[PDB]
């Protein structure tokens, strides 16, 4: 049960790692309502840029 719990909490923490990654993304998105923090990303939109 402990090693199963180890896998369960490792998977729970892995899901939490993906969940924390999503948190970073959504937090960045909400704070990105104002002008883009870096404009090097505007040049990634098109092959010509």
């Amino acid at each position: 049960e402990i090693r199963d719990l180890i896998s369960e909490i490792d998977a729970k923490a892995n899901a939490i790692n993906h969940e924390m990654r999503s948190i970073q993304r959504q937090a960045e998105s909400k704070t990105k309502s104002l002008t883009t923090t870096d404009k090097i990303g505007i040049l990634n939109q098109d092959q010509d840029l």
Binding site: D10, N14, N17, H18, R21
Partner: protein, 48 residues
Amino acid sequence: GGDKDQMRQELEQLEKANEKLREVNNSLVVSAQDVKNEERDIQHERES
């Protein structure tokens, strides 16, 4: 007696190695998921 002593020392070093392996597996999973996402995104964009 010899097995008990060697197993106890090996289990201490193995718990340390298991914690290290869990950390490195988590680091490898970050990379794995990120790569798979980048792959599917590139695929869809180029196709369209």
